[PDB]
Amino acid sequence: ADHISLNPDLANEDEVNSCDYWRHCAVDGFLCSCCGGTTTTCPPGSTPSPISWIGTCHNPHDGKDYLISYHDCCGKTACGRCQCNTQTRERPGYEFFLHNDVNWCMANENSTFHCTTSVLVGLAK
Amino acid sequence: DHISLNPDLANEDEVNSCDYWRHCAVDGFLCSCCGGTTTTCPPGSTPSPISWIGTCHNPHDGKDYLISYHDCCGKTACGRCQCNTQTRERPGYEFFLHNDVNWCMANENSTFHCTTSVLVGLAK
Amino acid sequence: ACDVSIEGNDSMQFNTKSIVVDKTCKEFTINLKHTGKLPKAAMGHNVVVSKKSDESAVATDGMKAGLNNDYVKAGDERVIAHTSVIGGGETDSVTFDVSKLKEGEDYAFFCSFPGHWSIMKGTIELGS
Amino acid sequence: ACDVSIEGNDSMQFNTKSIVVDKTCKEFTINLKHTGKLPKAAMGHNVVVSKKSDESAVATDGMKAGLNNDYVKAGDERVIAHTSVIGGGETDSVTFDVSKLKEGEDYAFFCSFPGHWSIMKGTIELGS
Amino acid sequence: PREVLTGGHSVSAPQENRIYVMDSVFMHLTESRVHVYDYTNGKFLGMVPTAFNGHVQVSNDGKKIYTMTTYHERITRGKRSDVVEVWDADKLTFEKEISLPPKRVQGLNYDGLFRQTTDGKFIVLQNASPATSIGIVDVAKGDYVEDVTAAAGCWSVIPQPNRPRSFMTICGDGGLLTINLGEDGKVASQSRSKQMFSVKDDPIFIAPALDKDKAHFVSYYGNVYSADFSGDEVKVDGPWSLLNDEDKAKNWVPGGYNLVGLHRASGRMYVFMHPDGKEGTHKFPAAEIWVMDTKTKQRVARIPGRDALSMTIDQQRNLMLTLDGGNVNVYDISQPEPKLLRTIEGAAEASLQVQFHPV
Amino acid sequence: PREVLTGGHSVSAPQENRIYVMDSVFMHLTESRVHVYDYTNGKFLGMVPTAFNGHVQVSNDGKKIYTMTTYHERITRGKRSDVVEVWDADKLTFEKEISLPPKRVQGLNYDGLFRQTTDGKFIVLQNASPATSIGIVDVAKGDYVEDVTAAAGCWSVIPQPNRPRSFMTICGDGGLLTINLGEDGKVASQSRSKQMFSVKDDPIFIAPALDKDKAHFVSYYGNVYSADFSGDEVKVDGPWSLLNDEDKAKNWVPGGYNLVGLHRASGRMYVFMHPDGKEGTHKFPAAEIWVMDTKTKQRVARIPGRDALSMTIDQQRNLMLTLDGGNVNVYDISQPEPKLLRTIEGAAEASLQVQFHPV
Ligand SMILES: [Cu+2]
Ligand SMILES: [Cu+2]
């Protein structure tokens, strides 16, 4: 018994494209679902980053907390659509992988930032 | 000379407005708002040897003057005081009177920074 | 048997969040493969076995040890065992005698490479 | 005397908007220097002598002639004389016998290189 | 490892739904790009970065996107690299780069500056050093194969839909120059037409209202000229006025950039117009859109311009797109009077050109 | 030829009047730049392009501008070139480029990511591949001379004003790592302090309130920690609260990026604060600016924050500049309570860092 809320594609566009969507609680960039991609897919021609910053978000629909991996899509200039700047549980650089003030496209073949995705890792425990 | 023919003498709110009489054919950013002046490139930007020509009317002396719109190049868009005036502007088949082409095109570096309004002389 | 091959990718993940060791096993060998392709200097991984609530402490002390000490304080008494740090394409292995895991207590395996233990953490248990 | 050196720069300008020819002069030599550094293919200059209100027509017809014809219709009867088209750093010269300039009429010199005659236009006159 | 980020995906919407908005991003011209939208629902589909003042077009076969732009080893300094890049239309991924002489036209996005021959074999582009010339690129060979210097003093490219590899260009003498290429891209022959319009007294906008065998043009003062190229030589005629005495009184004149369009199946021409015209307003936003019947030379319709500056027509679906710089308007032009279907807001920051994907 | 366009000019205003606003232009990050303003009249003086996410600082001698950025042969593809460029401060012209390993930190402009030693001999920068390390550049030799990998797991550079070439860095163990360079830029010695703060229970903002021989830090919950480095080893202490029971009730906490500042001559510390703090608001715009006396540990003043996010202090003129992302506020802090002198609007599109030219 997963739960409808655990899958963006079934959620109204107005919901997942809002900076208020529960799993975008630590996004600092542009939502890929508004750039020709989806919450878990890079828009055509953009490259997924192997690394990312981690957020612990609260799913208000099931009352549980989940780990979200914020991977970037790289290789293209700023998407400029659906800019979000949420900092829930975000921490400074000394806790590097929980920090979102650094471009997570940094290790890619090409580091120019295109947009940000919100991948569901699993329950936070 | 005539007090209207020299910018250094007019209030800057005057020369930095797209309405200033000699900016009648400008399509870019006024250099006087980018660290330069109506006739001087801002520090670090390079004057273009070519330009597009405009015939502007000086409402202060009622005469028409030729204005040479040279660009300052070598730096990214200034982004300040964008103007888009087309008085007497003509299409590409009259190339040097056309302002829809970057006049920084022949420079060592073609990226457009800002536009100047150089006074050539009376139109006759 | 007394074998296990755990993977690590450029995405900072282990292909296992739990490994079981049979009681029949005398000593235990744990092999690590770095399937990614980023150099160890940027995304190296290692596996460190230690007491579950004694993990944070080891990673912090390991960070200070440096890559020269595979990000594990030299001779840290809290470590049951630890592999070397490998990079993309590389592989390593560690063999430790199971006679070390204490009764009743919980044990987790993880990567001490600076910042990775937060996600690359798992639980290693005995028999059943 | 019967000499003149006119310049042309990358800024599409002549360093003279009027040249006078002494009546004493038999034939007249006009030298052109391209002080700029842009290749002739992009900013070449030339000098063409013709009747003042017969200038527009020659430049238009010269444009159709092509660079191979120094932007002057081959054998255009409206041209008193014309130099070749030079590029940056280059120089050329044209010699024409002054006995050609008609009485009472006005004569202007200019560059027929596509689009330049609008600014690179001058007036060449006799004695006084 | 519940979910995983994936790439390598293709455009979600089918080609028949895609349009391309060339966002010059003039405020930061070094980061211009192409926004790909679905004209049926206004959904953003993807994009192609085009560096400093890039130009774009879709291959006639609809399988590739062609871009033209300029690079510098250090953007504002270092070696200059003018190029044409070939992008796959469905994956929006870079495929090939074609070296161009460092003089490709740098300026606003008029269609005529970056076109292709009817056979889709060659890319025809405009150069300015500032001496003008038209360059030829063999798409297949991926090369710059010809430099048409005979075009000096002329501007913009106007393909001839009734010929495999021929095009015309407007010249400073008020006439049209026709270039016919050989199978290798090099000029095979050329011909000049008689003077079509007075440059100084009645300048035409360079944007053509293209038909299969002829092209129409509008002037700064509302006149209409035409160049028929169904025969060996181009037959020029004109002008006739878009204005009736009533219109002349209000001082109506055309205004915009890519301001005209032609619905071939009907002969209807669309034009951006505005009242109180005068020197310096030839690029003003459209107060209205006039629909003229080129056959009878009469206005059949007039509607709000919504401040548009550029448009484009799709013959197959009978659609018209207008662009005011940042928003796209979708129109149904199957009938004499246009019909506004939807408006796509924020399609761009600074765009003066929109194009349908070919079908 | 009445007038002529000239170049080669120097900044009109005198150095003592210039400030630098690092405009990241995040919407088009590939065209970030540095805007140079005159803080006395808010006049725009010039600029330095800094490509994709560039960082900047002025040499301690005030004669050169240092930038750090990233280039790609084709911006979005091709070879990557990380570099440090040296620009002349008065002519704002490019002078030298220094190759850097392709891992210079790419992110927001915290001061601590691009600094220089007190002697102005070396440029100390932050790397992330994502493994972190601190790189050393010998300005004179124009080279990258050392890679401090001992800093792995640590972040940001905090120069020691009381030493010629020493600096510290915050580490994941809650402690500070001190690096002392030799005359050639290579690490001579290092030392770690005791745990200064709890990473998980009371994280500090990386921005330091730097003094000559010590640095102060504020935490997510309003605590103040300090690192004294007047002695051989760093002496850490803390915390003490910026809050009184009344403040705690309103839930006041610090917020911003380069959110703290220290007026050395007075010991006064400035902090961006906001009410109703809670998880996720550590970067919220400032509701107020609190002025603390580090000596007596008491709040001496509080004023409107004007939504600032970053600030910077000038010890010599007793000035403070706050930046809300697009506007700069000029303050006189010679007295306990700040005094708003002027506001410079539109100094940038997206800037989180402003710096005075050294005097
Ligand atoms: Cu690891
Ligand atoms: Cu010439």
PDB file of N, CA, C and O in Angstrom, chain E residues 23 25 27-31 33 49 51-52 70-77 81 83 85 87 94 96-97 349, chain F residues 23 25 27-31 33 49 51-52 70-77 81 83 85 87 94 96-97 349:
ATOM      1  N   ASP E  23      14.006  33.113 -28.139  1.00  0.00           N
ATOM      2  CA  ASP E  23      14.153  34.123 -27.101  1.00  0.00           C
ATOM      3  C   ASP E  23      15.562  34.695 -27.142  1.00  0.00           C
ATOM      4  O   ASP E  23      16.519  34.045 -26.731  1.00  0.00           O
ATOM      5  N   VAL E  25      16.684  37.102 -25.380  1.00  0.00           N
ATOM      6  CA  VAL E  25      17.109  37.495 -24.034  1.00  0.00           C
ATOM      7  C   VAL E  25      18.090  38.666 -24.166  1.00  0.00           C
ATOM      8  O   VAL E  25      19.172  38.654 -23.589  1.00  0.00           O
ATOM      9  N   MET E  27      18.607  41.329 -22.763  1.00  0.00           N
ATOM     10  CA  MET E  27      19.210  41.861 -21.526  1.00  0.00           C
ATOM     11  C   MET E  27      20.494  41.092 -21.187  1.00  0.00           C
ATOM     12  O   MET E  27      21.389  41.604 -20.517  1.00  0.00           O
ATOM     13  N   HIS E  28      20.569  39.855 -21.654  1.00  0.00           N
ATOM     14  CA  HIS E  28      21.732  39.008 -21.436  1.00  0.00           C
ATOM     15  C   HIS E  28      21.892  38.193 -22.705  1.00  0.00           C
ATOM     16  O   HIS E  28      21.842  36.961 -22.689  1.00  0.00           O
ATOM     17  N   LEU E  29      22.086  38.925 -23.801  1.00  0.00           N
ATOM     18  CA  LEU E  29      22.209  38.364 -25.138  1.00  0.00           C
ATOM     19  C   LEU E  29      23.158  37.178 -25.265  1.00  0.00           C
ATOM     20  O   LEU E  29      23.056  36.393 -26.209  1.00  0.00           O
ATOM     21  N   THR E  30      24.076  37.032 -24.318  1.00  0.00           N
ATOM     22  CA  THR E  30      25.007  35.919 -24.382  1.00  0.00           C
ATOM     23  C   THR E  30      24.322  34.609 -24.002  1.00  0.00           C
ATOM     24  O   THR E  30      24.907  33.540 -24.154  1.00  0.00           O
ATOM     25  N   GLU E  31      23.084  34.685 -23.512  1.00  0.00           N
ATOM     26  CA  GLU E  31      22.363  33.469 -23.141  1.00  0.00           C
ATOM     27  C   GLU E  31      21.005  33.320 -23.836  1.00  0.00           C
ATOM     28  O   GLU E  31      20.020  32.891 -23.229  1.00  0.00           O
ATOM     29  N   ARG E  33      18.189  31.708 -26.325  1.00  0.00           N
ATOM     30  CA  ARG E  33      17.830  30.299 -26.465  1.00  0.00           C
ATOM     31  C   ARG E  33      16.547  30.110 -27.270  1.00  0.00           C
ATOM     32  O   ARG E  33      15.904  31.066 -27.676  1.00  0.00           O
ATOM     33  N   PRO E  49      19.956  25.849 -26.048  1.00  0.00           N
ATOM     34  CA  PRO E  49      20.749  27.051 -25.791  1.00  0.00           C
ATOM     35  C   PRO E  49      21.398  27.495 -27.102  1.00  0.00           C
ATOM     36  O   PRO E  49      21.848  26.660 -27.889  1.00  0.00           O
ATOM     37  N   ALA E  51      23.693  30.458 -27.233  1.00  0.00           N
ATOM     38  CA  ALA E  51      24.694  31.470 -26.921  1.00  0.00           C
ATOM     39  C   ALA E  51      24.307  32.913 -27.281  1.00  0.00           C
ATOM     40  O   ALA E  51      23.166  33.322 -27.085  1.00  0.00           O
ATOM     41  N   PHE E  52      25.265  33.672 -27.803  1.00  0.00           N
ATOM     42  CA  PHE E  52      25.055  35.074 -28.165  1.00  0.00           C
ATOM     43  C   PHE E  52      24.249  35.311 -29.445  1.00  0.00           C
ATOM     44  O   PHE E  52      24.692  34.963 -30.537  1.00  0.00           O
ATOM     45  N   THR E  70      27.271  32.569 -32.203  1.00  0.00           N
ATOM     46  CA  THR E  70      28.668  32.948 -32.084  1.00  0.00           C
ATOM     47  C   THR E  70      29.221  32.615 -30.707  1.00  0.00           C
ATOM     48  O   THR E  70      28.554  32.825 -29.688  1.00  0.00           O
ATOM     49  N   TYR E  71      30.444  32.094 -30.691  1.00  0.00           N
ATOM     50  CA  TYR E  71      31.131  31.737 -29.456  1.00  0.00           C
ATOM     51  C   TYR E  71      32.484  32.439 -29.425  1.00  0.00           C
ATOM     52  O   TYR E  71      32.993  32.891 -30.449  1.00  0.00           O
ATOM     53  N   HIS E  72      33.062  32.516 -28.238  1.00  0.00           N
ATOM     54  CA  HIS E  72      34.370  33.120 -28.032  1.00  0.00           C
ATOM     55  C   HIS E  72      35.009  32.284 -26.933  1.00  0.00           C
ATOM     56  O   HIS E  72      34.345  31.931 -25.958  1.00  0.00           O
ATOM     57  N   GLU E  73      36.285  31.953 -27.094  1.00  0.00           N
ATOM     58  CA  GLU E  73      36.984  31.133 -26.106  1.00  0.00           C
ATOM     59  C   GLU E  73      36.712  31.596 -24.674  1.00  0.00           C
ATOM     60  O   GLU E  73      36.726  30.795 -23.736  1.00  0.00           O
ATOM     61  N   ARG E  74      36.466  32.893 -24.511  1.00  0.00           N
ATOM     62  CA  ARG E  74      36.185  33.451 -23.193  1.00  0.00           C
ATOM     63  C   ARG E  74      34.984  34.386 -23.232  1.00  0.00           C
ATOM     64  O   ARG E  74      34.870  35.310 -22.423  1.00  0.00           O
ATOM     65  N   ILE E  75      34.096  34.137 -24.189  1.00  0.00           N
ATOM     66  CA  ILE E  75      32.879  34.922 -24.362  1.00  0.00           C
ATOM     67  C   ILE E  75      33.136  36.373 -24.763  1.00  0.00           C
ATOM     68  O   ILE E  75      32.781  36.775 -25.872  1.00  0.00           O
ATOM     69  N   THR E  76      33.753  37.147 -23.870  1.00  0.00           N
ATOM     70  CA  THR E  76      34.022  38.553 -24.142  1.00  0.00           C
ATOM     71  C   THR E  76      35.437  38.842 -24.625  1.00  0.00           C
ATOM     72  O   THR E  76      35.821  39.997 -24.780  1.00  0.00           O
ATOM     73  N   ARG E  77      36.205  37.782 -24.861  1.00  0.00           N
ATOM     74  CA  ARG E  77      37.576  37.897 -25.367  1.00  0.00           C
ATOM     75  C   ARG E  77      37.972  36.532 -25.896  1.00  0.00           C
ATOM     76  O   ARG E  77      37.279  35.548 -25.652  1.00  0.00           O
ATOM     77  N   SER E  81      34.157  32.084 -32.834  1.00  0.00           N
ATOM     78  CA  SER E  81      33.721  30.920 -33.589  1.00  0.00           C
ATOM     79  C   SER E  81      32.267  31.067 -34.002  1.00  0.00           C
ATOM     80  O   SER E  81      31.368  30.926 -33.168  1.00  0.00           O
ATOM     81  N   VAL E  83      29.139  29.643 -36.022  1.00  0.00           N
ATOM     82  CA  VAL E  83      28.778  28.296 -36.436  1.00  0.00           C
ATOM     83  C   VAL E  83      27.301  28.072 -36.691  1.00  0.00           C
ATOM     84  O   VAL E  83      26.447  28.908 -36.376  1.00  0.00           O
ATOM     85  N   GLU E  85      24.740  24.845 -35.918  1.00  0.00           N
ATOM     86  CA  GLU E  85      24.701  23.584 -35.192  1.00  0.00           C
ATOM     87  C   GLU E  85      23.447  22.831 -35.574  1.00  0.00           C
ATOM     88  O   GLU E  85      22.402  23.436 -35.811  1.00  0.00           O
ATOM     89  N   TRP E  87      20.765  20.171 -34.328  1.00  0.00           N
ATOM     90  CA  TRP E  87      20.186  19.543 -33.147  1.00  0.00           C
ATOM     91  C   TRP E  87      19.067  18.596 -33.535  1.00  0.00           C
ATOM     92  O   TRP E  87      18.284  18.884 -34.451  1.00  0.00           O
ATOM     93  N   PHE E  94      22.512  18.114 -29.057  1.00  0.00           N
ATOM     94  CA  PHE E  94      23.487  18.593 -30.030  1.00  0.00           C
ATOM     95  C   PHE E  94      24.051  17.439 -30.859  1.00  0.00           C
ATOM     96  O   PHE E  94      24.411  16.393 -30.310  1.00  0.00           O
ATOM     97  N   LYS E  96      25.841  18.121 -34.505  1.00  0.00           N
ATOM     98  CA  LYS E  96      26.942  18.540 -35.361  1.00  0.00           C
ATOM     99  C   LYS E  96      27.169  20.050 -35.374  1.00  0.00           C
ATOM    100  O   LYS E  96      26.234  20.836 -35.213  1.00  0.00           O
ATOM    101  N   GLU E  97      28.420  20.444 -35.575  1.00  0.00           N
ATOM    102  CA  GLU E  97      28.781  21.854 -35.637  1.00  0.00           C
ATOM    103  C   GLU E  97      29.424  22.124 -37.000  1.00  0.00           C
ATOM    104  O   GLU E  97      30.240  21.329 -37.470  1.00  0.00           O
ATOM    105  N   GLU E 349      11.357  36.085 -22.949  1.00  0.00           N
ATOM    106  CA  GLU E 349      11.683  37.362 -22.335  1.00  0.00           C
ATOM    107  C   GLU E 349      11.696  38.409 -23.441  1.00  0.00           C
ATOM    108  O   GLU E 349      11.017  39.431 -23.346  1.00  0.00           O
TER     109      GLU E 349
ATOM    110  N   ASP F  23      26.507  40.575  -9.183  1.00  0.00           N
ATOM    111  CA  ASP F  23      25.202  40.191  -9.695  1.00  0.00           C
ATOM    112  C   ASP F  23      25.282  38.816 -10.343  1.00  0.00           C
ATOM    113  O   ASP F  23      25.805  38.658 -11.451  1.00  0.00           O
ATOM    114  N   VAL F  25      22.862  37.104 -11.514  1.00  0.00           N
ATOM    115  CA  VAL F  25      21.909  37.003 -12.624  1.00  0.00           C
ATOM    116  C   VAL F  25      21.492  35.534 -12.741  1.00  0.00           C
ATOM    117  O   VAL F  25      21.532  34.945 -13.821  1.00  0.00           O
ATOM    118  N   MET F  27      18.896  33.992 -13.211  1.00  0.00           N
ATOM    119  CA  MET F  27      17.976  33.651 -14.307  1.00  0.00           C
ATOM    120  C   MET F  27      18.755  33.323 -15.586  1.00  0.00           C
ATOM    121  O   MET F  27      18.274  32.599 -16.457  1.00  0.00           O
ATOM    122  N   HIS F  28      19.954  33.879 -15.693  1.00  0.00           N
ATOM    123  CA  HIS F  28      20.832  33.626 -16.831  1.00  0.00           C
ATOM    124  C   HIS F  28      22.247  33.591 -16.270  1.00  0.00           C
ATOM    125  O   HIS F  28      23.114  34.380 -16.649  1.00  0.00           O
ATOM    126  N   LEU F  29      22.449  32.650 -15.352  1.00  0.00           N
ATOM    127  CA  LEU F  29      23.708  32.457 -14.647  1.00  0.00           C
ATOM    128  C   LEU F  29      24.956  32.461 -15.523  1.00  0.00           C
ATOM    129  O   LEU F  29      26.063  32.691 -15.035  1.00  0.00           O
ATOM    130  N   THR F  30      24.791  32.214 -16.814  1.00  0.00           N
ATOM    131  CA  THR F  30      25.943  32.207 -17.696  1.00  0.00           C
ATOM    132  C   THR F  30      26.414  33.628 -17.986  1.00  0.00           C
ATOM    133  O   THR F  30      27.464  33.827 -18.588  1.00  0.00           O
ATOM    134  N   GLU F  31      25.647  34.622 -17.553  1.00  0.00           N
ATOM    135  CA  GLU F  31      26.055  36.006 -17.779  1.00  0.00           C
ATOM    136  C   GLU F  31      26.122  36.846 -16.504  1.00  0.00           C
ATOM    137  O   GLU F  31      25.710  38.009 -16.491  1.00  0.00           O
ATOM    138  N   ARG F  33      27.838  39.047 -13.499  1.00  0.00           N
ATOM    139  CA  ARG F  33      28.809  40.125 -13.635  1.00  0.00           C
ATOM    140  C   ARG F  33      28.986  40.891 -12.339  1.00  0.00           C
ATOM    141  O   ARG F  33      28.304  40.628 -11.358  1.00  0.00           O
ATOM    142  N   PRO F  49      32.483  41.482 -16.672  1.00  0.00           N
ATOM    143  CA  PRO F  49      31.733  40.255 -16.955  1.00  0.00           C
ATOM    144  C   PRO F  49      32.430  39.084 -16.266  1.00  0.00           C
ATOM    145  O   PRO F  49      33.655  39.015 -16.249  1.00  0.00           O
ATOM    146  N   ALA F  51      31.154  35.575 -16.587  1.00  0.00           N
ATOM    147  CA  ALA F  51      30.571  34.332 -17.093  1.00  0.00           C
ATOM    148  C   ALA F  51      29.617  33.601 -16.138  1.00  0.00           C
ATOM    149  O   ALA F  51      28.811  34.220 -15.452  1.00  0.00           O
ATOM    150  N   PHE F  52      29.722  32.278 -16.100  1.00  0.00           N
ATOM    151  CA  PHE F  52      28.861  31.451 -15.259  1.00  0.00           C
ATOM    152  C   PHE F  52      29.203  31.478 -13.771  1.00  0.00           C
ATOM    153  O   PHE F  52      30.278  31.036 -13.369  1.00  0.00           O
ATOM    154  N   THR F  70      33.880  30.082 -14.500  1.00  0.00           N
ATOM    155  CA  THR F  70      34.012  28.889 -15.310  1.00  0.00           C
ATOM    156  C   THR F  70      33.601  29.148 -16.751  1.00  0.00           C
ATOM    157  O   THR F  70      32.599  29.819 -17.016  1.00  0.00           O
ATOM    158  N   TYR F  71      34.385  28.607 -17.675  1.00  0.00           N
ATOM    159  CA  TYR F  71      34.119  28.730 -19.096  1.00  0.00           C
ATOM    160  C   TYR F  71      34.056  27.331 -19.711  1.00  0.00           C
ATOM    161  O   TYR F  71      34.529  26.354 -19.125  1.00  0.00           O
ATOM    162  N   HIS F  72      33.475  27.257 -20.904  1.00  0.00           N
ATOM    163  CA  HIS F  72      33.355  26.020 -21.656  1.00  0.00           C
ATOM    164  C   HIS F  72      33.505  26.436 -23.113  1.00  0.00           C
ATOM    165  O   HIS F  72      32.919  27.435 -23.536  1.00  0.00           O
ATOM    166  N   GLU F  73      34.289  25.683 -23.879  1.00  0.00           N
ATOM    167  CA  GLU F  73      34.508  26.011 -25.289  1.00  0.00           C
ATOM    168  C   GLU F  73      33.210  26.387 -26.006  1.00  0.00           C
ATOM    169  O   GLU F  73      33.221  27.176 -26.951  1.00  0.00           O
ATOM    170  N   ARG F  74      32.095  25.821 -25.551  1.00  0.00           N
ATOM    171  CA  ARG F  74      30.795  26.097 -26.153  1.00  0.00           C
ATOM    172  C   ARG F  74      29.736  26.354 -25.092  1.00  0.00           C
ATOM    173  O   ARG F  74      28.547  26.111 -25.310  1.00  0.00           O
ATOM    174  N   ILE F  75      30.191  26.850 -23.942  1.00  0.00           N
ATOM    175  CA  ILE F  75      29.323  27.179 -22.820  1.00  0.00           C
ATOM    176  C   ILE F  75      28.607  25.971 -22.214  1.00  0.00           C
ATOM    177  O   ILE F  75      28.862  25.620 -21.061  1.00  0.00           O
ATOM    178  N   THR F  76      27.718  25.341 -22.984  1.00  0.00           N
ATOM    179  CA  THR F  76      26.967  24.189 -22.491  1.00  0.00           C
ATOM    180  C   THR F  76      27.538  22.842 -22.916  1.00  0.00           C
ATOM    181  O   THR F  76      26.930  21.802 -22.667  1.00  0.00           O
ATOM    182  N   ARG F  77      28.704  22.870 -23.556  1.00  0.00           N
ATOM    183  CA  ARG F  77      29.395  21.652 -23.995  1.00  0.00           C
ATOM    184  C   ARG F  77      30.833  22.037 -24.300  1.00  0.00           C
ATOM    185  O   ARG F  77      31.158  23.219 -24.380  1.00  0.00           O
ATOM    186  N   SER F  81      36.935  25.235 -18.380  1.00  0.00           N
ATOM    187  CA  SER F  81      38.076  26.026 -17.947  1.00  0.00           C
ATOM    188  C   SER F  81      37.737  26.844 -16.711  1.00  0.00           C
ATOM    189  O   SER F  81      37.040  27.854 -16.802  1.00  0.00           O
ATOM    190  N   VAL F  83      38.931  29.305 -13.803  1.00  0.00           N
ATOM    191  CA  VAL F  83      40.027  30.251 -13.723  1.00  0.00           C
ATOM    192  C   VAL F  83      39.849  31.363 -12.708  1.00  0.00           C
ATOM    193  O   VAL F  83      38.777  31.567 -12.131  1.00  0.00           O
ATOM    194  N   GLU F  85      40.821  35.430 -12.765  1.00  0.00           N
ATOM    195  CA  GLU F  85      41.275  36.477 -13.674  1.00  0.00           C
ATOM    196  C   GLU F  85      41.615  37.714 -12.882  1.00  0.00           C
ATOM    197  O   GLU F  85      40.959  38.023 -11.883  1.00  0.00           O
ATOM    198  N   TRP F  87      41.851  41.681 -13.008  1.00  0.00           N
ATOM    199  CA  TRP F  87      41.392  42.870 -13.705  1.00  0.00           C
ATOM    200  C   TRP F  87      41.928  44.135 -13.049  1.00  0.00           C
ATOM    201  O   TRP F  87      41.999  44.229 -11.817  1.00  0.00           O
ATOM    202  N   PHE F  94      40.723  43.424 -18.565  1.00  0.00           N
ATOM    203  CA  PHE F  94      41.306  42.112 -18.298  1.00  0.00           C
ATOM    204  C   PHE F  94      42.830  42.147 -18.404  1.00  0.00           C
ATOM    205  O   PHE F  94      43.368  42.710 -19.347  1.00  0.00           O
ATOM    206  N   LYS F  96      45.156  39.254 -16.633  1.00  0.00           N
ATOM    207  CA  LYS F  96      45.748  37.925 -16.543  1.00  0.00           C
ATOM    208  C   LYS F  96      44.745  36.835 -16.193  1.00  0.00           C
ATOM    209  O   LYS F  96      43.753  37.086 -15.514  1.00  0.00           O
ATOM    210  N   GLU F  97      45.020  35.620 -16.657  1.00  0.00           N
ATOM    211  CA  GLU F  97      44.159  34.476 -16.381  1.00  0.00           C
ATOM    212  C   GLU F  97      45.013  33.417 -15.711  1.00  0.00           C
ATOM    213  O   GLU F  97      46.141  33.180 -16.130  1.00  0.00           O
ATOM    214  N   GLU F 349      20.324  42.362 -10.383  1.00  0.00           N
ATOM    215  CA  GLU F 349      19.151  41.531 -10.600  1.00  0.00           C
ATOM    216  C   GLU F 349      19.077  40.519  -9.463  1.00  0.00           C
ATOM    217  O   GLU F 349      18.051  40.410  -8.795  1.00  0.00           O
TER     218      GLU F 349
END
